[PDB]
Amino acid sequence: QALSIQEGENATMNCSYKTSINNLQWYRQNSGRGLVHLILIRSNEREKHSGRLRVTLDTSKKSSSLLITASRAADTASYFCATDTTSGTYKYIFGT
Amino acid sequence: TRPRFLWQPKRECHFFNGTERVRFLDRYFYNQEESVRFDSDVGEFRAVTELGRPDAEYWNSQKDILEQARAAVDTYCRHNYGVVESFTVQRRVQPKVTVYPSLLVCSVSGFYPGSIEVRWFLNGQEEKAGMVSTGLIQNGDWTFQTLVMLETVPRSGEVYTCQVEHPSVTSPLTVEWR
Amino acid sequence: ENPVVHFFKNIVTP
Amino acid sequence: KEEHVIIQAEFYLNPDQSGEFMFDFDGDEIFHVDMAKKETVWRLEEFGRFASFEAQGALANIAVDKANLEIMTKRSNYTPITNVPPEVTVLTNSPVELREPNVLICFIDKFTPPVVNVTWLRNGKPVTTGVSETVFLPREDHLFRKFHYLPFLPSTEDVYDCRVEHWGLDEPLLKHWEFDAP
Amino acid sequence: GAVVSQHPSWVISKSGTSVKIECRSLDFQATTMFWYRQFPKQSLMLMATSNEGSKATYEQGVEKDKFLINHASLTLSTLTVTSAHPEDSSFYICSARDLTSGANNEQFFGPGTRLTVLEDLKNVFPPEVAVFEPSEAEISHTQKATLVCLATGFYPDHVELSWWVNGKEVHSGVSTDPQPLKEQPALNDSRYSLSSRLRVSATFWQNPRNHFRCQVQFYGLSENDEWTQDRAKPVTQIVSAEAWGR
Ligand SMILES: *[C@@]1(O)O[C@H](CO)[C@@H](O)[C@H](O)[C@H]1NC(C)=O
């Protein structure tokens, strides 16, 4: 139930979404935050850089997952992803 | 009467059996010639001529410019098609059929889609030879028109009938003449 | 409301 | 059954500094933006109740077309575009019948560059009001296609002419139409 | 490029007013923007979409009436909540699609805004901060000196606490408490308290000039906000506490 690491452990955040995606955005957070623009995963798979970060998009089960190869004090948070539904408007609705 | 230079880009998504097999295709044209392009099945830009090489190289160098051009077939084509099927892929407008003499002329007008079949029947039985068509003709207003002409000896008692087969109508349309 | 037709963003040439 | 093609066909043109951004569905315009009014204009009014498309993005997408255009003009050692003449032809919306509203169609096809001059003449006199046209509809071989419309009541009294002029046409091309058709 | 600015970051309006937030843009053009209303945990929620190009605006889920969006710039937008209530107190962040992204929808969220719509202005009060010199014990045992700050009695929780050592401000070594320990928490309207330590040392924590002053910025009630209470007006002032080296 905790991110035990001041160096290493695995971030395992399964962020889901409802409507079919086009673009996938990653935003983890502190309090009263603007963002955490990690990286963008668009319909495909595997793009996750800068270590504790790991973007795994799987349209099959409508869900992503951001893993951190190296926790820290700063990497503890409240994280969630936002997605734009396809053949819709440009609106983005975050998940959990 | 002064020279003109022309940049003609063309992003053409190709759908087959709906969205089951799409194919992006970014294509650029200096004046009327293709210089550099991008085939969604070739997974990366390619120059068709010299003028595009540099363009081909620099794009192939930037991850973005490739991570995008590839993501086309899903985040652009599948997308748009999803937005316009409703009113294009499914558009259907019935043919207005008319027959008047000259040589017999059967005119089909204002229909959509362009798929169509026009047959002539002479006294109950299709005449398979002696017909001159004009081919499909777009009008630029989302409706084609075509004329089929039958060459014959309009003898008394005879009844000619134009038969028009078109997705717009459930059972073929037919107008008789005389 | 109303679904929007996306346009392929133009990229700069060398 | 359902094998389709949607096209985003835009273009910039020096030294006229004009350009267009338009979508094509199996050869019919879905909509386009006018660098002139900065308003997107659907071909079939209705379509605009089913889909949205902010104009800028096109204009925006055009700027880059100029930029790139220039960049390619030089890279090409300033070679100019070879003119190709239009191939005019006159059509009628439907078969013409006296006193029955109809529509003359001037069909400007297979040309380039995308610049022309069309003029409707009802007995030598040119018509200025009520006419309409398409943008520069894209062809498969990359030339251009255009449509000019002039609604009218068919009659034998008067006749019409479409006058297309192009930088590949030595003398203005002139087409005739008179209550009748091949 | 990308940048975002929601003018009133911390705004206070009586339970019943009109607080207007201004989502602006940097050097990009925003034909369309969005307003998300988040709270403590629940994932950022989309309130409405606003887009110039006369096209009205599309309020989401059901939230329908009040809170009027006026997008006119293609640069700016504006979210004027109407009337007011102590249930509409949440975080308000806004994005703004870069009109040229085209496909690959590219949006850029703003800093945010916490609307403090208290039921009565009688609940506010700012805080005063004061420095604290290091122990002669720490400066010896570790050769390091943890100077500690703290503030006393503010509301709303609006503070940009800065550590300006020897003149200019430095942010290498600070630590500010995440959540406040409201004076009397078990009690509803308790003010808030926040502490921060500034361990720097380098044989300077106790040296010649060294002037370091703890700092606190407080977002005070709007000028056009009602104030009848006798106690001075809780304006948006900056309280500071200084300390020297020994
Ligand atoms: C049209 O462009 O054709 C001419 C040849 O380029 C041009 O000079 C003129 O602007 C237009 N013609 C007319 C009659 O307006």
XYZ file of C-alpha atoms and ligand atoms in Angstrom:
731
model
C 0.000 0.000 0.000
C 3.086 2.221 -0.224
C 5.843 3.266 -2.631
C 8.772 1.872 -0.647
C 11.901 3.394 -2.156
C 14.107 6.348 -1.929
C 15.669 4.810 -4.954
C 13.890 1.744 -6.280
C 10.547 -0.052 -6.330
C 7.932 -0.376 -9.062
C 5.257 2.239 -9.626
C 2.203 0.244 -10.597
C -0.603 2.580 -11.487
C -3.346 1.106 -13.616
C -5.236 4.016 -15.181
C -8.353 3.098 -17.152
C -10.738 4.901 -19.506
C -14.223 4.420 -21.002
C -14.566 5.753 -24.571
C -12.217 4.431 -27.268
C -8.966 6.412 -27.140
C -6.935 8.291 -29.716
C -4.403 10.042 -27.498
C -3.310 9.026 -23.990
C -1.883 11.621 -21.596
C -0.115 11.038 -18.278
C -0.550 13.328 -15.296
C 0.511 12.268 -11.783
C 0.286 14.840 -9.036
C 1.011 16.839 -5.918
C -1.554 19.287 -4.467
C -3.080 22.204 -6.391
C -1.134 21.032 -9.408
C -0.902 22.202 -13.000
C 0.416 18.884 -14.201
C 3.079 16.191 -14.543
C 3.209 16.042 -18.276
C 5.013 12.660 -18.369
C 4.620 11.289 -21.897
C 1.919 10.625 -24.525
C 0.841 7.172 -25.704
C -1.358 7.251 -28.799
C -3.066 4.102 -30.211
C -0.106 1.758 -30.361
C 2.168 0.370 -27.571
C 5.540 1.012 -25.579
C 6.905 4.519 -25.065
C 8.186 5.329 -21.577
C 11.390 7.182 -20.815
C 13.222 8.650 -17.953
C 13.219 5.811 -15.690
C 10.509 5.589 -13.211
C 7.926 6.038 -16.044
C 6.425 3.309 -18.125
C 3.716 3.745 -20.511
C 1.827 0.640 -21.458
C -1.312 1.206 -23.526
C -3.539 -1.804 -24.214
C -6.682 -0.953 -26.191
C -7.801 -4.566 -25.769
C -8.653 -4.065 -22.078
C -9.072 -0.283 -22.258
C -6.321 0.571 -19.764
C -2.825 1.983 -19.360
C -0.152 1.615 -16.669
C 2.717 3.831 -15.491
C 5.573 2.033 -13.708
C 8.487 3.718 -11.913
C 11.812 1.860 -12.028
C 12.950 4.163 -9.238
C 10.683 5.785 -6.630
C 11.654 8.947 -4.715
C 10.182 11.516 -2.356
C 8.949 13.625 -5.282
C 7.402 10.665 -7.158
C 4.885 9.925 -4.387
C 1.533 11.458 -5.314
C -1.982 11.411 -6.519
C -1.612 10.025 -10.357
C -4.155 9.750 -13.188
C -4.391 9.821 -16.984
C -6.563 11.822 -19.385
C -7.870 10.698 -22.760
C -9.565 12.169 -25.812
C -12.347 10.017 -27.193
C -12.102 9.281 -30.936
C -14.456 10.660 -33.553
C -15.650 12.994 -30.854
C -14.713 16.507 -29.801
C -11.293 17.484 -28.488
C -12.449 17.054 -24.870
C -10.186 15.150 -22.460
C -11.640 13.347 -19.437
C -9.203 12.103 -16.777
C -9.616 8.670 -15.176
C -8.352 7.709 -11.729
C 1.888 35.651 -67.701
C 4.444 35.329 -64.894
C 5.801 32.025 -63.521
C 3.950 30.371 -60.619
C 5.276 27.931 -58.028
C 2.960 25.349 -56.460
C 2.995 23.397 -53.189
C 0.433 20.581 -53.401
C 0.308 18.448 -50.280
C -2.213 15.600 -50.172
C -3.130 13.570 -47.101
C -5.247 10.741 -48.485
C -6.651 8.086 -46.142
C -7.703 4.881 -47.965
C -10.493 2.793 -46.416
C -11.379 -0.798 -47.462
C -14.438 -2.682 -46.257
C -15.020 0.205 -43.871
C -12.419 0.619 -41.158
C -11.106 -2.965 -41.182
C -8.092 -1.974 -43.301
C -7.011 1.658 -43.551
C -3.986 3.126 -45.312
C -2.627 6.639 -44.681
C -0.631 8.264 -47.454
C 0.935 11.656 -47.047
C 1.936 12.968 -50.477
C 3.689 16.196 -51.459
C 3.920 17.817 -54.904
C 6.157 20.702 -55.996
C 4.180 22.118 -58.951
C 2.440 19.100 -60.410
C 5.134 16.295 -59.455
C 5.298 14.031 -56.441
C 8.518 14.777 -54.509
C 8.368 13.091 -51.107
C 5.676 10.866 -49.663
C 4.644 8.642 -46.795
C 2.902 5.300 -47.186
C 1.312 3.937 -44.011
C 2.479 0.452 -44.978
C 6.063 1.526 -45.606
C 6.211 2.862 -42.063
C 8.394 5.837 -42.939
C 8.886 8.598 -45.464
C 10.438 8.038 -48.870
C 11.440 10.478 -51.587
C 10.045 9.734 -55.035
C 12.292 12.319 -56.615
C 15.345 14.305 -55.624
C 13.647 17.539 -54.550
C 12.199 15.529 -51.653
C 15.235 13.648 -50.385
C 16.246 16.280 -47.838
C 12.597 16.350 -46.789
C 12.595 12.577 -46.630
C 15.719 12.534 -44.462
C 14.842 15.288 -42.008
C 11.408 13.889 -41.300
C 12.790 10.411 -40.881
C 15.179 11.932 -38.365
C 12.589 13.524 -36.083
C 10.812 10.956 -33.916
C 7.749 13.175 -33.577
C 7.329 13.669 -37.305
C 7.333 9.879 -37.618
C 5.551 8.906 -34.434
C 2.804 11.098 -35.910
C 2.756 10.155 -39.593
C 2.473 6.563 -38.418
C -0.244 7.263 -35.843
C -2.166 8.686 -38.775
C -4.051 5.554 -39.765
C -5.643 5.493 -36.344
C -5.828 8.991 -34.951
C -6.783 10.715 -38.181
C -8.318 8.340 -40.755
C -10.279 5.973 -38.475
C -11.237 9.191 -36.709
C -12.595 11.235 -39.569
C -14.261 8.254 -41.199
C -16.030 7.850 -37.905
C -17.273 11.418 -38.195
C -18.417 11.461 -41.780
C -19.808 7.975 -42.496
C -23.168 9.132 -41.214
C -23.520 11.623 -44.128
C -21.194 10.395 -46.894
C -20.481 6.686 -46.809
C -24.224 6.262 -46.246
C -25.472 9.107 -48.452
C -28.183 7.920 -50.844
C -30.218 9.943 -53.341
C -32.734 8.400 -55.691
C -32.441 8.650 -59.473
C -34.873 10.739 -61.446
C -35.432 8.705 -64.634
C -36.754 10.129 -67.867
C -37.030 8.776 -71.374
C -37.413 10.882 -74.490
C -36.626 10.275 -78.200
C -34.138 11.428 -80.792
C -32.578 6.983 -81.111
C -34.004 6.424 -77.629
C -32.582 8.241 -74.626
C -32.843 7.241 -71.034
C -31.618 9.864 -68.619
C -30.781 9.173 -65.002
C -30.036 12.326 -63.000
C -29.290 13.679 -59.533
C -28.493 10.312 -57.959
C -25.886 9.297 -55.380
C -23.801 7.188 -54.854
C -22.462 6.866 -58.353
C -22.839 3.085 -58.528
C -25.540 2.351 -61.076
C -26.960 0.037 -63.693
C -29.160 1.125 -66.572
C -30.847 -1.483 -68.710
C -33.136 -1.326 -71.727
C -36.018 -3.681 -72.383
C -37.779 -3.974 -75.701
C -41.261 -5.254 -75.302
C -40.584 -7.043 -72.077
C -37.131 -8.328 -72.922
C -33.792 -6.653 -72.282
C -32.004 -5.551 -75.436
C -28.335 -6.279 -74.866
C -26.874 -4.492 -77.885
C -27.153 -1.087 -79.501
C -26.636 1.071 -76.453
C -24.436 4.141 -76.127
C -23.628 5.452 -72.644
C -22.006 8.656 -71.426
C -20.558 7.271 -68.264
C -20.987 8.614 -64.773
C -20.810 12.382 -64.499
C -20.207 14.300 -61.275
C -21.955 17.624 -60.996
C -19.954 18.915 -58.069
C -23.076 19.034 -55.916
C -22.877 15.498 -54.541
C -25.016 13.881 -57.297
C -24.050 12.108 -60.581
C -25.972 11.859 -63.831
C -25.632 9.650 -66.898
C -27.464 9.127 -70.119
C -27.853 5.870 -71.966
C -29.060 5.883 -75.529
C -30.623 3.008 -77.410
C -30.605 3.023 -81.225
C -33.827 1.556 -82.651
C -36.748 1.558 -85.066
C -39.685 2.760 -82.953
C -42.336 0.550 -84.545
C -45.984 0.747 -83.472
C -47.175 -1.396 -80.592
C -43.619 -1.635 -79.271
C -43.004 -0.602 -75.676
C -39.548 0.447 -74.467
C -38.626 0.501 -70.858
C -35.662 1.923 -69.119
C -34.626 0.033 -66.010
C -32.450 1.767 -63.454
C -30.822 -0.202 -60.627
C -29.500 1.906 -57.758
C -28.740 1.506 -54.065
C -31.067 4.397 -53.479
C -34.078 2.360 -54.429
C -35.248 -1.062 -53.085
C -36.652 -2.447 -56.346
C -35.262 -1.132 -59.688
C -36.948 1.919 -61.271
C -38.497 1.624 -64.709
C -40.133 4.068 -67.039
C -41.821 2.952 -70.230
C -42.044 4.958 -73.399
C -45.103 4.557 -75.627
C -21.371 19.563 -29.409
C -20.633 17.948 -32.781
C -17.770 15.652 -33.636
C -14.884 17.385 -35.091
C -13.039 16.532 -38.309
C -9.335 16.370 -37.433
C -6.853 17.734 -39.944
C -3.362 16.307 -40.420
C -0.966 18.922 -39.021
C 1.499 20.246 -41.562
C 5.161 19.797 -40.804
C 8.046 22.033 -41.897
C 10.420 20.893 -44.600
C 14.266 21.047 -44.270
C -19.377 -1.856 -51.451
C -17.784 0.654 -49.074
C -14.311 0.912 -50.464
C -13.655 4.706 -49.870
C -11.158 7.553 -49.962
C -11.164 10.798 -47.933
C -8.648 13.492 -48.875
C -7.210 16.563 -47.193
C -6.068 18.493 -50.263
C -4.553 21.904 -49.560
C -2.227 24.151 -51.553
C -0.319 27.439 -51.647
C 0.540 29.431 -54.748
C 3.207 32.048 -55.444
C 3.274 34.629 -56.600
C -0.520 34.842 -56.280
C -0.170 34.227 -52.555
C -3.485 32.356 -52.581
C -4.314 28.963 -51.158
C -7.052 26.516 -50.214
C -7.701 23.756 -47.675
C -10.487 21.296 -48.572
C -11.581 17.723 -47.840
C -12.561 15.286 -50.580
C -14.850 12.234 -50.269
C -14.536 9.973 -53.271
C -14.396 13.107 -55.392
C -16.941 15.393 -53.748
C -16.079 18.314 -51.503
C -17.043 17.769 -47.869
C -16.034 21.343 -46.936
C -13.265 23.940 -47.273
C -11.867 27.096 -45.657
C -11.321 30.380 -47.460
C -8.042 32.090 -46.626
C -10.222 35.014 -47.719
C -13.036 34.936 -45.142
C -11.413 32.644 -42.588
C -14.710 30.751 -42.401
C -15.056 27.042 -43.115
C -17.752 26.339 -45.678
C -19.398 22.916 -46.039
C -20.405 21.890 -49.559
C -23.762 20.669 -48.408
C -24.963 23.176 -45.850
C -26.405 20.319 -43.863
C -23.059 18.616 -43.210
C -22.410 21.488 -40.820
C -24.997 20.112 -38.409
C -23.132 16.822 -38.182
C -19.479 17.817 -37.960
C -17.378 20.718 -36.774
C -14.057 22.053 -38.015
C -12.521 25.304 -36.775
C -11.163 27.310 -39.726
C -7.869 28.499 -38.273
C -6.287 25.092 -38.162
C -6.516 25.261 -41.943
C -5.246 28.775 -42.298
C -2.618 27.749 -39.787
C -1.898 24.673 -41.832
C -1.539 26.952 -44.861
C 1.112 29.281 -43.438
C 3.363 26.273 -43.286
C 2.379 25.617 -46.899
C 3.778 28.993 -47.972
C 6.880 28.617 -45.841
C 7.441 25.162 -47.305
C 6.429 26.440 -50.738
C 9.177 29.039 -50.822
C 11.683 26.625 -49.344
C 10.929 24.267 -52.258
C 10.944 26.973 -54.905
C 14.612 27.704 -54.156
C 15.652 24.086 -53.568
C 14.337 23.612 -57.115
C 16.638 26.233 -58.567
C 13.644 28.462 -59.212
C 12.066 26.296 -61.874
C 8.482 27.432 -62.648
C 5.360 25.304 -62.941
C 4.504 24.093 -66.441
C 1.007 25.348 -67.386
C -1.694 22.880 -68.425
C -4.825 24.140 -70.244
C -8.404 23.529 -69.058
C -10.800 21.296 -70.971
C -14.162 23.040 -70.705
C -17.552 21.434 -71.274
C -21.174 22.564 -70.772
C -23.723 20.585 -68.764
C -27.254 20.936 -67.645
C -28.329 19.883 -64.169
C -31.057 17.654 -65.635
C -32.692 17.345 -69.052
C -33.922 20.826 -69.990
C -37.639 21.411 -70.378
C -39.220 24.755 -71.269
C -40.304 26.968 -68.368
C -38.841 24.377 -65.930
C -36.152 25.748 -63.560
C -32.866 24.111 -64.322
C -29.162 24.807 -64.065
C -26.358 25.274 -66.559
C -23.112 23.693 -65.439
C -19.721 24.947 -66.579
C -17.315 22.078 -66.056
C -13.670 23.277 -65.909
C -11.614 20.071 -65.792
C -8.046 18.746 -66.051
C -5.911 21.862 -65.610
C -3.329 23.706 -63.481
C -2.111 25.795 -61.767
C -5.270 26.390 -59.674
C -6.063 29.799 -61.197
C -8.810 30.607 -63.675
C -11.403 33.071 -64.911
C -14.950 31.980 -65.643
C -17.644 34.145 -67.145
C -21.308 33.344 -67.912
C -22.811 34.954 -70.977
C -26.525 34.959 -71.762
C -26.517 36.310 -75.316
C -23.119 37.952 -75.212
C -24.112 39.817 -72.069
C -22.228 38.480 -69.022
C -24.036 37.377 -65.900
C -22.762 38.627 -62.590
C -25.430 37.786 -60.065
C -26.806 34.471 -58.878
C -23.898 32.372 -60.107
C -21.853 30.002 -57.966
C -18.730 27.875 -58.024
C -16.699 25.200 -56.348
C -13.194 25.610 -54.962
C -10.397 23.802 -56.723
C -11.505 20.201 -56.535
C -8.535 17.745 -56.559
C -8.101 15.167 -59.321
C -6.317 11.797 -59.215
C -3.490 12.765 -61.577
C -3.031 15.895 -59.475
C -4.449 18.483 -61.872
C -7.529 20.500 -60.942
C -11.280 20.346 -61.512
C -13.814 23.180 -61.030
C -17.545 23.794 -61.298
C -19.512 26.926 -62.158
C -23.258 27.035 -61.788
C -25.865 29.296 -63.326
C -29.485 28.352 -62.529
C -32.006 29.457 -65.184
C -35.376 28.943 -66.844
C -34.759 27.000 -70.086
C -35.851 28.688 -73.283
C -35.189 28.924 -77.007
C -35.239 32.713 -77.019
C -31.884 33.118 -75.308
C -28.648 31.121 -75.375
C -25.600 30.820 -73.123
C -21.813 30.644 -73.169
C -19.178 29.707 -70.652
C -15.925 31.628 -71.065
C -12.955 30.026 -69.354
C -9.532 31.678 -69.584
C -6.257 29.996 -68.551
C -2.495 30.577 -68.544
C -2.190 27.656 -70.941
C -5.028 28.746 -73.112
C -3.711 31.110 -75.806
C -7.140 32.626 -76.435
C -10.089 32.585 -74.026
C -11.819 29.212 -74.273
C -15.476 29.627 -75.193
C -18.298 27.092 -74.828
C -21.841 27.343 -76.160
C -25.211 25.974 -75.083
C -28.545 26.524 -76.506
C -31.802 24.870 -75.476
C -30.695 21.478 -76.779
C -27.979 18.909 -75.977
C -26.131 15.873 -77.437
C 4.910 27.147 -27.252
C 2.805 26.684 -24.133
C 1.858 28.568 -20.980
C -1.347 29.260 -19.045
C -2.691 31.901 -16.707
C -5.808 31.746 -14.567
C -5.745 35.269 -13.090
C -7.437 34.849 -9.696
C -5.430 31.910 -8.284
C -6.862 32.398 -4.801
C -10.134 34.299 -4.806
C -12.567 34.900 -1.976
C -16.233 35.770 -2.552
C -19.064 35.772 0.011
C -21.543 32.893 -0.187
C -23.453 34.676 -2.910
C -21.536 36.818 -5.412
C -19.876 36.523 -8.801
C -16.190 35.206 -8.978
C -14.828 35.334 -12.539
C -11.768 33.327 -13.613
C -9.831 34.250 -16.776
C -8.169 31.338 -18.593
C -5.674 33.042 -20.924
C -3.050 31.874 -23.394
C 0.617 32.414 -24.073
C 1.833 32.836 -27.641
C -0.460 30.344 -29.073
C -4.015 30.740 -30.334
C -6.784 28.884 -28.533
C -9.938 28.414 -30.509
C -11.188 26.103 -27.746
C -10.516 25.695 -24.016
C -11.920 23.705 -21.119
C -12.743 24.178 -17.446
C -12.095 21.328 -15.033
C -13.348 21.537 -11.421
C -11.353 19.306 -9.078
C -11.525 18.889 -5.298
C -9.392 16.910 -2.776
C -9.264 13.330 -4.460
C -11.818 12.788 -7.253
C -10.044 12.952 -10.622
C -10.156 16.331 -12.379
C -13.712 16.777 -13.659
C -14.666 18.493 -16.946
C -17.241 21.210 -16.377
C -17.610 22.602 -19.848
C -15.992 23.294 -23.177
C -15.743 26.851 -24.435
C -14.878 27.847 -27.950
C -14.764 31.047 -29.912
C -16.287 30.709 -33.331
C -19.624 31.761 -31.863
C -20.629 28.181 -31.279
C -22.059 28.657 -27.581
C -20.361 26.201 -25.406
C -20.988 22.746 -24.264
C -21.640 22.217 -20.570
C -20.929 18.567 -19.693
C -22.554 15.906 -17.522
C -25.366 18.017 -16.000
C -24.271 21.077 -14.156
C -26.242 23.034 -16.436
C -27.402 26.339 -15.108
C -25.157 28.988 -13.486
C -21.340 29.415 -13.878
C -21.313 31.247 -17.293
C -18.506 30.802 -19.845
C -17.689 33.682 -22.207
C -15.006 32.760 -24.762
C -14.198 35.656 -27.075
C -10.478 36.069 -27.555
C -8.875 33.141 -29.214
C -6.555 34.057 -26.625
C -8.977 34.383 -23.500
C -12.062 32.685 -21.991
C -13.886 33.513 -18.780
C -15.731 31.519 -16.176
C -18.065 33.589 -14.037
C -19.723 31.484 -11.370
C -23.065 33.035 -10.456
C -24.449 33.549 -6.965
C -22.237 31.403 -4.740
C -22.146 28.635 -2.191
C -19.778 26.821 0.196
C -20.039 23.644 -1.874
C -18.686 25.222 -5.039
C -15.357 25.516 -3.249
C -12.960 23.391 -5.280
C -10.019 23.646 -7.629
C -10.550 25.157 -11.054
C -8.035 24.261 -13.752
C -8.338 25.058 -17.483
C -6.686 23.720 -20.641
C -6.555 25.125 -24.179
C -6.044 23.072 -27.356
C -3.390 24.555 -29.627
C -5.480 25.493 -32.619
C -2.809 24.135 -34.902
C -2.224 20.721 -33.304
C -4.758 19.382 -35.793
C -4.777 15.647 -35.147
C -2.716 14.932 -32.048
C -4.935 17.135 -29.924
C -2.438 19.319 -28.044
C -3.785 20.972 -24.886
C -2.001 22.928 -22.134
C -3.497 23.272 -18.616
C -3.229 26.388 -16.476
C -1.861 26.818 -12.931
C -5.294 26.696 -11.355
C -7.519 28.607 -8.959
C -8.940 27.850 -5.502
C -12.135 29.807 -4.994
C -12.568 30.423 -1.281
C -16.283 31.197 -1.071
C -16.664 31.348 2.704
C -20.104 31.690 4.292
C -19.057 34.693 6.385
C -16.100 37.065 6.103
C -15.863 36.783 9.905
C -13.868 33.580 9.421
C -10.751 35.182 7.853
C -7.504 36.516 9.423
C -4.002 36.710 8.085
C -0.739 35.217 9.841
C 2.539 36.703 11.035
C 5.802 34.814 10.583
C 8.953 34.986 12.735
C 12.473 33.531 12.376
C 14.330 31.119 14.682
C 18.119 31.027 15.159
C 19.991 27.675 15.225
C 21.071 25.974 18.439
C 24.729 26.321 19.400
C 24.379 22.551 19.853
C 23.497 21.724 16.234
C 26.053 24.102 14.750
C 28.701 22.107 16.623
C 27.552 18.471 16.624
C 26.884 18.562 12.878
C 28.572 21.763 11.691
C 25.153 22.501 10.185
C 22.411 24.918 11.281
C 18.725 24.189 10.660
C 17.022 27.597 10.908
C 13.251 27.064 11.289
C 10.273 29.235 10.297
C 6.539 29.150 10.948
C 3.449 31.381 10.534
C 0.568 32.083 12.925
C -3.150 32.315 12.136
C -4.053 32.815 8.473
C -7.143 32.284 6.329
C -7.764 31.569 3.528
C -4.853 29.169 3.123
C -3.135 31.438 0.628
C 0.624 31.669 1.057
C 3.725 31.811 -1.145
C 6.357 31.250 1.573
C 9.820 32.237 0.315
C 13.331 31.978 1.777
C 15.480 34.955 0.807
C 19.000 34.418 2.145
C 21.459 37.335 2.197
C 19.298 39.505 -0.051
C 18.203 37.529 -3.100
C 15.896 34.519 -2.675
C 17.287 30.968 -2.744
C 15.304 27.712 -2.923
C 18.095 25.188 -2.281
C 17.445 23.614 1.123
C 13.897 24.508 2.154
C 11.080 22.244 3.434
C 7.487 23.443 3.940
C 4.770 21.419 5.713
C 2.365 19.807 3.169
C -0.894 20.260 5.099
C -1.711 22.792 7.867
C -2.512 22.038 11.491
C -5.514 24.337 11.803
C -5.227 26.118 15.174
C -8.301 24.325 16.528
C -8.999 21.532 13.984
C -11.571 19.637 16.059
C -13.293 23.017 15.852
C -14.806 24.065 12.508
C -13.299 27.484 11.712
C -9.735 27.010 12.986
C -7.060 29.171 11.321
C -4.036 27.418 9.764
C -0.368 26.954 10.751
C 2.578 26.018 8.459
C 6.265 25.464 9.348
C 9.421 25.422 7.203
C 13.080 24.767 8.040
C 16.049 26.235 6.127
C 19.199 24.206 6.824
C 22.013 25.796 4.830
C 25.148 26.195 6.918
C 28.554 26.443 5.182
C 29.795 28.251 8.266
C 27.455 31.070 7.298
C 24.386 30.242 9.413
C 26.404 32.229 11.942
C 28.546 34.725 10.037
C 28.900 38.454 9.351
C 26.144 39.965 7.248
C 24.022 37.098 6.206
C 20.679 38.708 6.261
C 17.878 35.997 5.857
C 14.209 36.778 6.330
C 11.461 34.168 6.355
C 8.654 35.274 4.038
C 4.925 34.724 3.552
C 2.575 36.080 0.872
C -1.118 36.105 1.773
C -3.913 36.306 -0.798
C -6.279 38.718 0.915
C -9.945 39.541 0.380
C -10.826 41.436 -2.800
C -11.021 45.238 -2.669
C -14.701 45.039 -3.632
C -15.345 42.563 -0.795
C -17.553 43.520 2.151
C -15.778 44.252 5.438
C -17.613 45.454 8.548
C -15.611 43.702 11.290
C -13.537 46.031 13.475
C -10.261 44.126 13.015
C -8.206 45.557 10.127
C -8.978 44.499 6.543
C -7.280 41.166 5.662
C -5.797 42.602 2.441
C -3.336 40.702 0.222
C -0.171 41.770 2.057
C 3.277 40.225 2.551
C 4.437 39.450 6.094
C 8.152 38.919 6.728
C 10.477 37.875 9.551
C 14.248 38.348 9.398
C 17.302 36.814 11.030
C 21.059 37.432 11.056
C 24.164 35.302 11.486
C 25.872 34.996 14.872
C -7.768 35.897 -64.680
O -6.814 35.669 -63.688
O -7.168 35.647 -65.954
C -6.214 36.665 -66.359
C -4.983 35.922 -66.806
O -4.133 35.679 -65.696
C -5.861 37.630 -65.199
O -4.977 38.637 -65.670
C -7.101 38.288 -64.584
O -6.819 38.650 -63.238
C -8.290 37.334 -64.609
N -9.129 37.629 -65.755
C -10.173 38.445 -65.615
C -10.980 38.769 -66.864
O -10.500 38.933 -64.530
